């Protein structure tokens, strides 16, 4: 398996800097055309930068002067140094082999998983987790969940019973409130008959604030 | 610099349908064109390169054709997981290359009514000072749904928000939440909180409700 | 003897660029019709030795035949030094070097691990190794044939039309 594993996004204030990492396996980074591509929230893809195995570098006009593509052969990693960051640079960034061409070797066949970069003056804040308790109950089934309120920045990850329960689970995309903080809910359908029998724990994780919370959702 | 216009911007089709997406170049670019598929917040997947070559891996139902200024991407028979945004990308201009604006594909299916649930604010949230009422609409199609908050039969406005999941990979349905947020003081001013849902799969609007404390 | 280099019937591919040593005596620029005529260190023998280099490239790539330039051509095919003293002469050759359905005779190097030193020439066709596994002379994944051909068709845009190029270097 050829893979590109990315790391090191995060929150940063306008003017600040950040370095993105892309560790490669099955591909020699120093021997290849390599590329960084990004996507602002709800927008199209934009090619950001390209580097040649010989060393030549190319940049979109919007980031020229402020961004630097680089690599290290001994750690087989591609890097993007970002300086003088701004709100417009808020995006999900992807590394890739190739330069976007149309010949094998320069085609962009393998990509990284992406990392979020958030350029904002707003501070980090951990979420509150509140239970959405069942009542009594329609069509044999019943619904419950967890409200994950008032946090910044993204993302949050929710699992149920440490990953045991997955079928019937809906974790909604987070919504930005007028406070500037994000909020989401995770819900799940379960048999109504098994409410005083089964125990449901939602496991909320907010890495930016180092928050790990487990909330037990009981019928009240 | 070259500028690419795709068409259409949005497009709905049933499992098994033929699907066609066009990409138009503002000048001739020979066969210097690529197609990518992208699921919402995930990495792009290269489908077609050099206008018409099938990238290794990619299922055979994807095919591309065109030259100069007009290019088409064709899904011969839509699979239920093929929903994504499809991008074209010219490889003709100076580096770095540019993309088209994207064509979003949704799966079409038979109407499915939502199951409605309503949740009062937790006691622990009210102790903090705030109150959130959640209304859940589970596994329905199509996406369009009216959700009205009613407080002692007074319609609410400007203090709720909706979030929708992506289409289910197997049966193409949606789920939706609607969250009404009030101060504890405002919450304690009224009694009957109701969630009135209108939807094509429902013969009549469906209300779920409660009384504060009860 | 600049006639044997400018008016030559056949030109070299840029990766296998041609070099003619001149032992010899502005007549070129005055009977021009050239699209590019840029001299460096001098403006129009008083020289130990002079060289004439000639090859074919795309229209958009002629900008790379210049000191301190980057690109596939300058990095992997033909490199001018920073201190270059000489002239770079280019002209559109669509009427000779393009054919209907494409002229695929002119090639360029698309893959190389490191840049060429000034006036370095590389005509090897060893399979390029993009990963840690050796290719053993066979093409495939991460194993690319280094050379790629231009497709000169008469109806290509000017940036993708063939340009013949002569580089005079004085020393
Ligand atoms: C290249 O050729 C130009 C055109 O003249 C051609 O060559 C002469 C000898 C005759 O055969 C004539 O019929 C041809 O059309 C010359 O004007 C030009 O000087 C030549 N280039 C150089 C560098 O001498």
Residues C130, A54: C-beta atoms closer than 8 Å: no
- From chain C, pick out residues whose CB is under 8 angstroms from the CB of A55: 75, 114-115
Whether residue B104 is found in the same domain as residue B143: no
Q: Are C82 and C70 in contact (CB under 8 A)?
A: no
> Contact at 8 Å (CB) between B22 and B70?
yes
Would an 8 Å CB–CB cutoff place A3 in contact with chain C?
A: no
Does residue B159 contact residue B180 with C-beta atoms inside 8 Å?
A: yes
Is some CB atom of chain B closer than 8 A to the CB atom of A198? no
State how far the Cα of A124 lies from the Cα of A158, in Å rounded to an integer. 19
In terms of domains, do B8 and B101 share one? yes
Distance C161 CA to ligand 1 centre (A): 23
Based on the domain organization, do B41 and B82 belong to the same domain? yes
Q: Contact A184/B165 with Cβ under 8 angstroms?
A: no
- C153/A contact by beta carbon, under 8 A: no
* Tokens 């390209």 belong to residue: A50
Q: Do B130 and B35 fall into the same domain?
A: no
Tokens at residue C56, please?
A: 């074919």
Final residue belonging to a domain, choices A60, A92, A119: A119
Q: Are residues B89 and B168 in the same domain?
A: no
Based on the structure, what is the number of domains in chain A?
2
- Single residue among B108, B124, B146 that ends a domain in this structure: B108
Residues of B in contact with A104 (CB under 8 A): 49
Distance, CA C3 to ligand 1 centroid (Å)? 7
Task: Decide which of A64, A88, A119 is a domain's last residue.
Answer: A119
The reply to whether A90 and A141 lie within a common domain is no
Domain-terminating residue out of B76, B91, B108: B108
Considering the domain architecture, whether residues A14 and A104 belong to the same structural domain is answered as: yes
DSSP C64: G
List residues of chain C with CB under 8 Å from any CB of chain B. 60, 151, 156-157, 160
Same domain, A7 and A78: yes
Write b or e for each residue in A175-205: b if 16 or more Cβ atoms lie within 10 A of its Cβ, otherwise e: eeeeeebbbbbbbbbbebeebeeeebebbbb
- DSSP conformation letters of A43-68: S-EEEEEEE-TTS-EEE-TTTTTTEE
Q: Which residues sit opposite C168 in a β-bridge?
A: C52, C87
Measured CA to CA, the distance from residue A179 to residue A209 in angstroms comes to 18
Best CA proximity match to C123, nearest among C139, C137, C138, C112: C112
Domain membership of residue B29 as a residue range:
4-108
Subunits close to B (at least 3 CB pairs below 8 A): A, C
- Residue carrying the six token digits 């707003």: A122
**CA-wise closest residue to A35 among A50, A55, A21:** A50
Domain count, chain B: 2
Q: Which of C2, C5, C7, C54 for mutating ligand 1's site (highest number of atoms within 8 Å of CB)?
A: C7
- How far away is chain B from the Cα of C168, in angstroms, using its nearest Cα? 28
In which domain, by residue range, is A14 found?
3-119
Are B175 and B161 in contact, with CB atoms under 8 Å apart? no
Q: Are residues B119 and B195 located together in one domain of the fold?
A: yes
Output the six-digit token pair for B110.
Answer: 């038979």
Pocket of ligand 1 (CB under 6 A): C 2-3, 6-7, 28, 31
Residue C94 near residue C162 (C-beta atoms within 8 A): yes
Out of C60, C151, C157, the one facing B28 most closely (by C-beta) is C157
Task: Find how far residue B119's CA is from the centre of its chain.
Answer: 25
Task: State whether A175 and A78 are in the same domain.
Answer: no
Q: Please name the member of A32, A54, A105 whose beta carbon is closest to the beta carbon of C115.
A: A54
- Chain A residues near residue B117 by CB distance under 8 angstroms: 138, 143, 187
Q: What residue owns the CA closest to ligand 1's atom 4?
A: C7
Please give, rounded to a whole number of angstroms, the shortest distance from the CA of B72 to a CA of chain C.
Answer: 21
Distance from the CA of C7 to the center of ligand 1, in angstroms? 7
What is the Cα–Cα distance from B185 to B189, expressed in whole angstroms?
7
Clarify whether residues A64 and A137 are in a common domain. Answer: no
Query: How far apart, in whole angstroms, are the C-alpha atoms of residue A164 and residue A105?
Result: 43
Ligand 1 atom nearest to CA at C2: 23
Q: Tell me: do B103 and B122 sit in the same domain.
A: no
Q: For strand B130-140 and strand A67-72, is the pairing parallel, antiparallel, or unpaired? A: unpaired
Q: Kindly list the residues from chain B whose CB atom is less than 8 angstroms away from the CB atom of residue C157.
A: 27-28
* Whole-angstrom distance, CA of residue A18 vs CA of residue A85: 8
> What DSSP line would sit under chain B, residue for residue?
---EEEE-SEEEEETT--EEEEEEESS--TT-EEEEEE-TTS--EEEEETTTEEPTTS-TTEEEEEETTEEEEEESS--TT--EEEEEEE-SSSSSPEE---EEEEEE---BPPEEEEEPPPHHHHHHTEEEEEEEEEEEBSS--EEEEEETTEE--SSEEEEEPPPPTTT--EEEEEEEEEEHHHHTT--EEEEEEE-TT-SS-EEEEEETT-
Domain shared by A98 and A176, yes or no: no
| Spatial CA neighbour of A123 closest among A88, A152, A99, A84 | A152
What's the first-to-final CA gap in chain A, in angstroms? 50
For residues B133 and B91, membership in a common domain is answered with no
**What's the CATH code of the domain at A135?**
2.60.40.10
Domain coordinates in residue numbering, chain C: 1-101+154-171, 102-153
- Decide if B91 contacts B97 (C-beta within 8 A): yes
Same structural domain for residues A20 and A67?
yes
Q: Within this chain, do residues A133 and A115 fall inside the same structural domain, yes or no? A: no
Q: What is the resolution of this structure in A?
A: 2.8
Asked which of B63, B82, B108 is the last residue of a domain, the reply is: B108
**Chain A residues 56-115 within an 8 A CB cutoff of chain B:** 58-60, 92, 94, 99-104, 107-109, 111-114
Other beta carbons less than 10 A from residue C114's beta carbon = 13
C18 Cβ neighbours under 8 A, 6+ residues apart: C11, C12, C53, C54, C55
How many angstroms separate the CA atoms of C166 and C171, rounded? Answer: 17
- B98 and B38 belong to one structural domain: yes
CA C97 to chain CA mean position, Å? 14
CA B100/CA B87 separation, integer angstroms: 6
Same domain, B70 and B37: yes
Pair A106, A145 in one domain: no
**Residue A11 to residue A120: CA distance in whole angstroms:** 7
Residues 6+ apart with CB under 8 A from A150: A125, A127, A128, A177, A179, A181, A182, A183
**B87: domain CATH number?**
2.60.40.10
Measured between its terminal Cα atoms, the distance across chain C in Å is: 18
- For residues B130 and B102, state if they share a domain: no
Q: Tell me the CA–centroid distance for residue C31 and ligand 1, in Å.
A: 10
Q: Which tokens in the block code for residue A68? A: 């630097």
Contact assignment for A31 to C113 by CB distance below 8 Å: yes
Last residue of a domain, one of A60, A88, A119: A119
A37 and A82 in a single domain? The answer is: yes
What is the residue whose two structure tokens read 């299916």? Answer: B109
Whats the size of chain C, residue-wise? 171
Do A176 and A75 lie in one domain? The reply is no
Estimate the share of chain A in helix, then strand, then coil, as percent rounded to the nearest 5: 5, 50, 45
- Say if residue A109 is in the same domain as residue A32: yes
């Amino acid at each position: 398996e050829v893979q590109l594993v990315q790391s090191g996004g995060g929150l940063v204030k306008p003017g600040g800097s950040l370095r993105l990492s892309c560790a490669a396996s099955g591909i020699t980074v120093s021997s290849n055309y390599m590329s960084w591509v990004r996507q602002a929230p709800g927008k199209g893809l934009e090619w950001v930068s390209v580097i040649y195995s010989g060393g030549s570098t190319y940049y979109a006009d919007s980031v020229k002067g402020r961004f630097t593509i680089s690599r290290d052969n001994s750690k087989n990693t591609l890097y993007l140094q970002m300086n003088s960051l701004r709100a417009e640079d808020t995006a999900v960034y992807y590394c890739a082999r190739g330069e976007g061409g149309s010949i094998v070797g320069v085609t962009s066949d393998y990509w990284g998983q992406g990392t979020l970069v958030t350029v904002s003056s707003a501070s980090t804040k951990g979420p509150s987790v509140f239970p959405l308790a069942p009542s009594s109950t329609s069509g044999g089934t019943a619904a419950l969940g967890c409200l994950v309120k008032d946090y910044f920045p993204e993302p949050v990850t929710v699992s149920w019973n440490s990953g045991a329960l997955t079928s019937g689970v809906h974790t909604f995309p987070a919504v930005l409130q007028s406070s500037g903080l994000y909020s989401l809910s995770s819900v799940v359908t379960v048999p109504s008959s098994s409410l005083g029998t089964q125990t449901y724990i939602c496991n909320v994780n907010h890495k930016p604030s180092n928050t790990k919370v487990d909330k037990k959702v009981e019928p009240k | 610099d070259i500028q690419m216009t795709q068409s259409p911007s949005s497009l709905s089709a049933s499992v098994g349908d033929r699907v066609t997406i066009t990409c138009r170049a503002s000048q001739s670019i020979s066969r210097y064109l690529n197609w990518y598929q992208q699921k919402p917040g995930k990495a792009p997947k290269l489908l077609i390169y050099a206008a018409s070559s099938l990238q290794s891996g990619v299922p055979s139902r994807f095919s591309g054709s065109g030259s100069e200024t007009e290019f088409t991407l064709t899904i011969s028979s839509l699979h239920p997981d093929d929903f994504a945004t499809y991008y074209c990308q010219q490889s003709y201009s100076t580096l770095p290359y540019t993309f088209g604006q994207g064509t979003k594909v949704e799966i079409k299916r038979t109407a499915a009514a939502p199951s409605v649930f309503i949740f009062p604010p937790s006691d622990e949230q009210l102790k903090s000072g705030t109150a959130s009422v959640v209304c859940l609409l589970n596994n329905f199609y199509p996406r369009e749904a009216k959700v009205q908050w009613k407080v002692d039969n007074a319609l609410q406005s400007g203090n709720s928000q909706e979030s929708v999941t992506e289409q289910d990979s197997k049966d193409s349905t949606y789920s939706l939440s609607s969250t009404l947020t009030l101060s504890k003081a405002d919450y304690e001013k009224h009694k009957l909180y109701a969630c009135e849902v209108t939807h094509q799969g429902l013969s009549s609007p469906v209300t779920k409700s409660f009384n504060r404390g009860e | 003897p600049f006639g044997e280099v400018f008016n030559a019937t056949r030109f070299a591919s840029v990766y296998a660029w041609n070099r003619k040593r001149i032992s010899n005596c502005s007549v070129l620029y005055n009977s021009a019709s050239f699209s590019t005529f840029k001299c460096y260190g001098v403006s129009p023998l008083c020289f130990t030795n002079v060289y004439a280099d000639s090859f074919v490239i795309r229209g958009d790539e002629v900008r790379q035949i210049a000191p301190g330039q980057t690109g596939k051509i300058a990095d992997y095919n033909y490199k001018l030094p920073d201190d270059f003293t000489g002239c770079v002469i280019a002209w559109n050759s669509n009427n000779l070097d393009s054919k209907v359905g494409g002229n695929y005779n002119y090639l360029y190097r698309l893959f190389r691990k490191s840049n060429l030193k000034p006036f370095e020439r590389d005509i090897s066709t060893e399979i390029y190794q993009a990963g840690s596994t050796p290719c053993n002379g066979v093409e495939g994944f991460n194993c690319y044939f280094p050379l790629q051909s231009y497709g000169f068709q008469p109806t290509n845009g000017v940036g993708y039309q063939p340009y013949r190029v002569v580089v005079l270097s004085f020393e």
